[PDB]
Ligand binder design. Sequence first.
Ligand SMILES: O=C(NC1CC1)c1cnn2cccnc12
Length: 119
Amino acid sequence: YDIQAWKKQCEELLNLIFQCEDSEPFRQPVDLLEYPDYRDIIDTPMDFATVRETLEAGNYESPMELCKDVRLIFSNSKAYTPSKRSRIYSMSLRLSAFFEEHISSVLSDYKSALRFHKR
Ligand SMILES: O=C(NC1CC1)c1cnn2cccnc12
């Protein structure tokens, strides 16, 4: 029923993601000194600190918008990798599976709560 519950649920999920060793490459914006051609490949950089900051600033209206940004972190990694076997891309796939498994109920509860609100 709670149309606002998704926000704390997303904060707690982001805390789990930061505790996860697989999030290490994605915790802060990609360093262009480390990867000089990154912006030649990636149009819209995204990282978990930016997601957390957007959420804490009150700049997400729904968990769907947060999901879109988290999914962009993973699609950027898939686009930048030269190999399906790279260490960082492999970490992104595990972290994506963990994220999708935990965000499913957040989106479901939010959409259900909003449908109840607008009934
Ligand atoms: O997403 C990647 N890098 C960004 C987060 C730092 C990334 C994916 N595969 N890969 C291989 C070598 C170097 N960096 C990568």
